[PDB]
Design a protein around this ligand. Structure first.
Ligand SMILES: Nc1ncnc2c1ncn2[C@@H]1O[C@H](CSCC[C@H](N)C(=O)O)[C@@H](O)[C@H]1O
Ligand SMILES: [Zn+2]
Ligand SMILES: [Zn+2]
Lengths: 231, 275, 672, 255, 226, 255
RNA sequence: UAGGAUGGGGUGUGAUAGGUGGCACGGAGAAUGGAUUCUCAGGGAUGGGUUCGAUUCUCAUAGUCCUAGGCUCCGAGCUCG
């Protein structure tokens, strides 16, 4: 991963930040794409001159486009994109014992940040990735998405969250088929309880390790991997 | 260039000859001892030019004039037929095209044989349950192999059929082989799924009969002929049917069709109707 | 006018085939000889007779008109509405004589164009008949020679330089322009006039060819003194391209005749079909005899000034480039024939097995095929060699002498000297037409051998008298060679008609050394006779002829040593055989056990049959089969059953072919 | 049995919704056709008789569906079954390097709005209406049936927005079934394959034949009456809950 | 509907198989109870009347199944539906810090999975001789593969392995038999005897699967959302 | 890292097992190739050097596998990783109406015994050896990796017995993860699909070329070194457990 | 064995002793609201030949369909010439 340039959506914290810290340590170059008011600027200072913070609202085409133009200015190319930004909401669809209905605005906001924002990033960075000169394996880039196991078995009150992550799960295969003739691999990670066995909470570093493994391995494509310790 | 000047002449004579000629087709032109053969070859080129230009003209004339799927182009259908072919190559019933007839065939016949093989394979791919096509006795450097690779271009390496230089007797138990030929004394009563049928890829316009029968009798293979007359009235028409009609008949019988449905692929100009 | 015209030599003048040409054209077809065996030769070499408009006969002689009856029957069966004959005016009388033993002009129409008639021209050829009278109404010193002049061919149109004056090219508007210039008319004033050679190839006046027959030295001077020949010979007007000479070699070597050909010019060719040709005419016949000889050599013996010697299928094109053409020349190679027999699936082992298993009178089967001549079997005939000095001919079909000459080669002259009598049993077009050929060849053989010229003895029905009487009176002298005995006088219940008849029949028994001669009436037609001969040695031979199982025949021929019976059809079609008055195999076979013969022989096989009939399991050790040119001796009777397996193997394909044809006829019936 | 049931059918003016209404009304149920105001459902409601009523309501909007449900409760007094058949399809590649076109965002948003958000907007309000019902013998109060697609599991090229919406419906089918299970409302999902709905019948005959041949068995486009049959079977069977049923003849979508 | 159809039910002497036979015979079908000789199935066959018959057979053997299918073809002349309800289970953990015994794994595997394939391959031989109806169908084959194939519990390794194999092989067999016109479907029965599933609801679902012509090559979880 | 780990690799004489032995031995892990004595296992072990050992054992037999594990324990004293790459296949249709043939029961049971029963036999016997290790930091005691080709999900025509066995392995993957969790052994499964394994050699090379071209990306057969890379990634990563990972470049099987 | 009828090698059909016109459908390869562009196959039985130009004009070979039969010459009137 030496010399490679990555754009990491949601890189100011969580799985995105852990991926940027590990990959840059391994000698890669990372672009942190996150909201302007996030504290990711301190992180981009911490990682040194190989890292750059690009302020962008993922739901807006213009903000992401200018962030990508910043990436083109700093490094000239994009090789990896990791989608991690998101929020969660717990609320039952309907509760007869209290007469309460899930509000539509909360559902729309979760869908906005999680599912459509991910596609917006994919569709724009694929335009950026298409400018790369093919790898000796024919590869132009790698796109990695995060769709927690809630897409498969959600808990009570996660309907909107499970809907968004199931959307990303359904979206993985058609995008991989879309970008296959361009040479971009699309992969999905299904994280669980990240901060039977292992019984502790997951460590974001194991997610970063899996991201590096997916980047390195040329044959992983169009698949969802549950990294959940079998719970 | 002597003959280029000669063709300019015949053209100056106003004969049916083409506007221009390429080097390789000129070297083909000198492959004909009889002046009549040169005439017929040249008329074939002239008529090719004639229709090519006529169609370009009509092409230029017409130019003056919530979906669920993106247009399902020709490639997607081709890939689906590819998957069906790849299954047929593993579990399908074998069907053999028996080469080695390259010696007996004039250039015109060899070209037409290649065209019929192309169409027959095309009809085979689209069918619901294709045969496993074998090309046996297919010489690598023979005339047919070079024409097939020319006609298919880079598709040739990707066709889902088995091409071999061996003979069919080296691949299958000799009891199960049946050489299909119109001259056979035995009449095909029913299509048998456990047998292997051999079709001679041989086009001669009905002109040297008994070649397939001679090859069969030289060996100890079983032989059969189609029951054309028994189940269909006849009139003026050869009984050696084209390769694509043979394959579409066998594909019809293979799918449990009856004779009165299978013989629909016989050209209607050859027979009046069913008995 | 036609664009191509060429000749072809069907027969090259060999003693067993005569000589004949064949003029080919796109619009008409012509022939110039109709002798014995010409019909068989033309069928063998695939010469179509469909559009044989005219037949030219160069001389009234049985060696030249021998196969005329066979052709007439063939043309009637082809469906031709009219055929026109040309030659001596006596043909009309000849045509009258033909109807006695046939029908009178049934369906088809016959016409005659004698030499005295005005010349006849067609769209492809103009024909002149030249009468020639020898030195020193029947006329025995007339020979007709033909001079055929072709039509003028318009020259080609020169298109390459036609654009120089600006004539249109590639449109139908030039069609009237081309027609005018090709006819010698100048094209009109298309800004200026253009005439004839300025745009058109000069015309070709036509190349003519001459056919000349000179049977003897007596005709040399009449040919030289003829004025009409000098009209074409000594001039430059279209010098006759080729002259076909049909004359014995002794005539050609004459100095006067030799100078006559040379005066035709240096470019003129000369074709000669004389008696010196060495070429095989019947390839299939040669193949079969060579093939069968591998089985038993004794039973199947082997057969036997610029100028151009004629060959079979030799051609000469006339309109195109005038060149000689050696492309259809027959090629005889015994090695290939024996190779084909050995490669048969079952032929080779059987003949080895047959050989490890192991004189007068002797019977030679010259002919066994029925009504019409076919490719392999000729018409009926049978030669019997009673003694080394005597022989008896049992039936004389058309071209019988040709088959006899091929079988015996140069020995033919000696055999005819031993020829004592000829038997005619029923007046069919395939049982008697070959008789006149035998008499003339017998006379020639007697002259060569130095034997005295004693008349031959013929025993035949009285109706044959009228046919020969008219032919002798009108066409060619024959009767001074024969002493004919009516067949009725040799019947079991016959009575002495005249003392003269008794002397001849008594003479026949002494000459042929027979102990007694008898005849009987079989039931085939009116005045149809059998025969039976008993020798002092004690052996008896009975000949049935065309018949069905009869009771009078059975009583007379009891305990015969060898019986020859008709086997036209098989067991499948006994009703048709009864309708056509013929016997089937089992009917004939049943007859043999009842007649209690030592051996049984079959003949008169039908035209449906190609090579062999069906060998039913009822075929015992006494019943045999006959083929052309086979030798049968009394000692070969035990051998004959052993030959059945090899003959089946050698004729695997044809017997296979006959069964498919019978199946196909059934299929058409079924599909009806 | 379905005798006497009252059904609310979204997208009922055509296709699977119409076939479901035709079956249930024919079998003796009552139906409310829920579709856009400008549609042709008014004719269909006349066709089905006085047991059926047309309610003009856009499923993306709360107020329309609430008005329609108030109409339904006024006319028949209860809601026993809900069938979700409304939806739209859009096909467009995410990005195409050869010519440089990119998937426009508004087509993605409006697909999510109609398919995924419209479905949840209907489910939560209908579940609100069924929550007032007296529980049937066995604790059940009602059944809600959704219409996913096989595109939710193996999307083809250009169905990113469509597959995203149907995958969201598949993902969310189980947590909602667990939410309303204590209340006694059953939630089920049907995943039809190639069906002869107007979305597919408008295609040319050649591609229609190609799509029909792709099904292993039976090799034909699904007949909407068979979808109505499975819907009825789900209504009758008390133990189908929180499951996705592929009604596709074992077909698998080639890329 | 299912009236007049002939169904072969393995394990038909009790449980889900028997409840399926009771439903189909009540609806007017004909049923053959194929079960072990000691199962007491002859009493159940006597209860359901002359439309039902019991054929003693051990499904893990080819001969017993062949004799039972011969008996069914003699009695009714036809086979239209096959339901595989036979099976056994164990609850031994793979390893217990003791090792899982091999004989129990072989026995449950061959009774569940091997018996099912043996029945499928022989009934398809019987089913292939029917004339296809107006829809082209020749028969329906229904299998049982408990939800343990997806969320197997502790100690259900052998059981979950067998049901997972049935789930995995449902689609390839459906693809194999598709040109013959035989539909193949799978049901995943959950906790059967907020209450346990009643076998009559399984029999109802089986009838629904038989009637609906377009369900093929699918696994249906009849589990009540557990 | 994998430095110092001891791995037992079944089917290690060729294909994926040899590729895995090559990678781990190259990375400094000691390996034991467990394969039938007929194979050239001892040649590969001699080639790989001192860190590789060939153990002749038949996986369907308890005593051979027990002997092989005893040999491994004697040589290296412990087992930390186990990889199950042994397997066989058969191409035979369940029933064939046209040819009138039926899949034999012996062939199905033989494939089932080698693929499915042999895998469980190895897991259950290795676990008895792994149960003796003192736990690694973090509660892990050992790792078990299985191979279940993509046929377990979308098996092709004529692949019923193989698909049934791999479907069983997929089904029982999670149950074993629940069984061994209290003792700290992780069980993982790889679905490699079209690889460099000789199973993709019995088929004609043209079928192999078509299948390779049909992979979305990269349009080629898998390289066994990529399987070994994924195996190392699984060994290193502590949180992958009881899950099936499809390694096929996103190809989906058509019949 | 003979005579005729005729042969569109992807399928239906025309311009019919010579100039004119072919039309509609189908197939192979490589790329994009069911259409488009390029490319491949375009010898009206097979092989010779003629004409300024041949599908139609001629021959040879092969396939295919249909069809293939028999005595009066004159008066005595079973025999006579
Ligand atoms: N009517 C028929 N009956 C049986 N086989 C036939 C047939 N028509 C064509 N075929 C088969 O398909 C091929 C092409 S037809 C060519 C016939 C062959 N070359 C010959 O000269 O006679 C043949 O090899 C034949 O085996
Ligand atoms: Zn006669
Ligand atoms: Zn006769």
């Amino acid at each position: 991963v030496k010399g490679l340039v990555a754009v990491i959506t949601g890189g100011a914290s969580g799985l995105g930040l852990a991926t940027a810290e590990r990959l840059v340590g391994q000698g890669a170059s990372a672009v942190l794409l996150d909201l302007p008011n996030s504290g990711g600027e301190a992180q981009a200072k911490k990682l040194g001159n190989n890292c750059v913070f690009a302020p962008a609202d993922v739901t807006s085409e213009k903000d992401v486009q200018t962030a990508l133009a910043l990436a083109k200015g700093k490094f000239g190319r994009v090789d990896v994109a990791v989608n991690c930004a998101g929020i969660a909401v717990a609320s039952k669809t309907y509760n007869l014992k209290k007469g309460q209905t899930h509000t539509l605005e909360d559902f729309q906001r979760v869908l906005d940040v999680n599912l459509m924002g991910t596609f917006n990033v994919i569709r724009l960075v694929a335009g950026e990735m298409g400018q790369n000169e093919p790898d000796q394996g024919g590869q132009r880039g790698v796109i990695i998405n995060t769709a927690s196991v809630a897409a498969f078995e959600g808990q009570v009150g996660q309907a909107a969250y499970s809907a968004s992550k199931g959307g990303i799960v359904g979206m993985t295969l058609p995008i991989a088929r879309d970008l296959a003739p361009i040479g971009i691999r699309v992969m999905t990670i299904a994280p669980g309880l990240f901060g039977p066995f292992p019984s502790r909470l997951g460590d974001p570093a194991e997610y970063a390790h899996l991201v590096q493994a997916i980047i390195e391995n040329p044959f992983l494509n169009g698949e969802v991997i549950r990294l959940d310790g079998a719970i | 260039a002597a003959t280029r000047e000669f063709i300019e002449m015949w053209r100056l004579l106003g004969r049916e000859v083409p506007e221009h000629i390429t080097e390789e087709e000129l070297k083909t032109l000198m492959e004909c001892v009889s002046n009549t053969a040169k005439k017929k070859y040249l008329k074939y080129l002239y008529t090719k030019e004639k229709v090519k230009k006529a169609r370009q003209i009509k092409k230029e004339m017409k130019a003056a004039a919530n979906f669920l799927f993106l247009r399902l182009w020709d490639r997607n259908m081709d890939i689906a037929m590819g998957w069906k072919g790849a299954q047929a190559m593993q579990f399908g019933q074998p069907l053999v095209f028996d080469m080695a007839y390259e010696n007996y065939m004039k250039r015109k016949e060899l070209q037409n044989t290649v065209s019929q093989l192309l169409e027959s394979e095309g009809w085979n791919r689209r069918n619901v349950d294709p045969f496993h096509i074998y090309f046996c006795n297919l010489k690598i450097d023979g005339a047919l192999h070079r024409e097939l690779v020319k006609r298919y271009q880079e598709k040739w390496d990707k066709l889902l059929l088995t091409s071999t230089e061996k003979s069919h007797v080296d691949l299958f138990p000799k009891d199960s082989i049946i050489y299909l030929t119109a001259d056979s004394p035995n009449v095909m009563t029913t299509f048998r799924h456990d047998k292997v049928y051999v079709i001679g890829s041989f086009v001669d316009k009905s002109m040297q009969p008994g070649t397939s029968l001679a090859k069969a009798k030289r060996l100890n293979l079983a032989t059969e002929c189609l029951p054309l007359d028994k189940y269909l009235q006849w009139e003026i028409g050869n009984k050696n049917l084209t390769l694509d009609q043979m394959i579409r008949i066998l594909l019809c019988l293979k799918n449990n069709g009856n004779w009165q449905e299978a013989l629909q692929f016989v050209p209607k100009r050859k027979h009046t109707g069913f008995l | 006018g036609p664009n191509t015209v060429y000749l072809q030599v069907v027969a090259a003048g060999s003693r067993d085939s005569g000589a004949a040409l064949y003029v080919f054209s796109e619009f008409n077809r012509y022939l110039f000889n109709c002798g014995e065996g010409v019909q068989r030769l033309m069928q063998e070499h695939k010469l179509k007779v469909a559009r044989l408009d005219n037949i030219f006969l160069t001389r009234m002689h049985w060696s030249n008109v021998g196969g005329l009856s066979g052709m007439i029957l063939t043309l009637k069966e082809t469906g031709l509405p009219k055929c026109v004959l040309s030659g001596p005016p006596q043909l009309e009388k000849y045509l009258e004589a033909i109807k006695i033993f046939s029908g009178p002009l049934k369906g088809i129409e016959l016409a005659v164009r004698p030499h005295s008639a005005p010349e006849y021209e067609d769209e492809t050829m103009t024909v002149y008949q030249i009468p020639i009278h020898s030195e020193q109404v029947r006329d025995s010193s007339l020979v007709v020679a033909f001079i055929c002049k072709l039509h003028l061919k318009r020259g080609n149109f020169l298109v390459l330089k036609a654009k120089e004056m600006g004539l249109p090219v590639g449109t139908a508007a030039i069609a009237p322009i081309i027609a005018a210039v090709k006819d010698g008319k100048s094209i009109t004033h298309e800004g200026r006039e253009i005439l004839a050679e300025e745009l058109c190839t000069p015309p070709d006046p036509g190349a003519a060819f001459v056919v000349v027959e000179c049977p003897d030295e007596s005709f040399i001077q009449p040919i030289c003194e003829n004025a009409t020949f000098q009209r074409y010979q000594g001039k430059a007007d279209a010098p006759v391209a080729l002259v076909v000479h049909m004359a014995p070699a002794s005539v050609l070597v004459d100095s006067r005749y030799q100078q006559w050909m040379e005066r035709f010019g240096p470019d003129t060719q000369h074709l000669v079909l004389n008696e010196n040709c060495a070429s095989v005419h019947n390839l299939r016949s040669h193949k079969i005899q060579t093939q069968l000889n591998l089985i038993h050599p004794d039973i199947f013996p082997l057969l036997t000034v610029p100028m151009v010697q004629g060959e079979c299928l030799l051609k000469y094109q006339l309109r195109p480039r005038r060149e000689w053409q050696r492309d259809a020349i027959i090629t005889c190679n015994p090695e290939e024939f024996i190779v084909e027999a050995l490669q048969l699936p079952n032929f080779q082992q059987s003949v080895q097995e047959y050989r490890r298993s192991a004189q007068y009178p002797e019977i030679i089967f010259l002919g066994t095929g029925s009504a019409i001549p076919m490719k392999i079997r000729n018409v009926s005939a049978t030669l019997v060699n009673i003694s080394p000095d005597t022989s008896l001919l049992l039936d004389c079909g058309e071209g019988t002498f040709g088959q006899l000459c091929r079988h015996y080669g140069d020995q033919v002259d000696r055999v005819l000297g031993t020829l004592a009598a000829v038997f005619v049993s029923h007046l069919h077009a395939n049982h008697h037409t070959g008789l006149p050929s035998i008499l003339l060849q017998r006379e020639r053989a007697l002259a060569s051998l130095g034997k005295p010229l004693h008349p031959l003895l013929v025993v035949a029905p009285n109706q044959l008298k009228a046919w020969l009487q008219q032919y002798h009176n009108q066409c060619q002298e024959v009767l001074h060679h024969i002493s004919m005995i009516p067949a009725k006088c040799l019947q079991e219940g016959a009575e002495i008609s005249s003392p003269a008849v008794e002397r001849l029949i008594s003479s026949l028994l002494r000459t042929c050394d027979l102990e007694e001669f008898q005849t009987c009436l079989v039931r085939h037609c009116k005045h149809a006779f059998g025969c039976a001969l008993v020798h002092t040695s004690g052996w008896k031979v009975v000949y049935s002829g065309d018949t069905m199982p009869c009771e009078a025949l059975v009583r007379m021929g009891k305990d015969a040593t060898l019986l020859i019976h008709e086997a036209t059809l098989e067991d499948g079609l006994e009703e048709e055989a009864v309708e056509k008055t013929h016997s089937t195999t089992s009917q004939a076979i049943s007859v043999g056990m009842r007649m209690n013969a030592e051996f049984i022989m079959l003949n008169h096989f039908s035209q449906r049959y190609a090579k062999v009939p069906l060998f039913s399991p009822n075929f015992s050790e006494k019943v045999g089969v006959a083929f052309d040119h086979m030798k049968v001796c009394f000692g070969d009777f035990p051998t004959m059953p052993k030959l059945i397996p090899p003959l089946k193997a050698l004729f695997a394909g044809d017997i296979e072919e006959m069964e498919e044809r019978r199946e196909k006829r059934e299929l058409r019936q079924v599909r009806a």
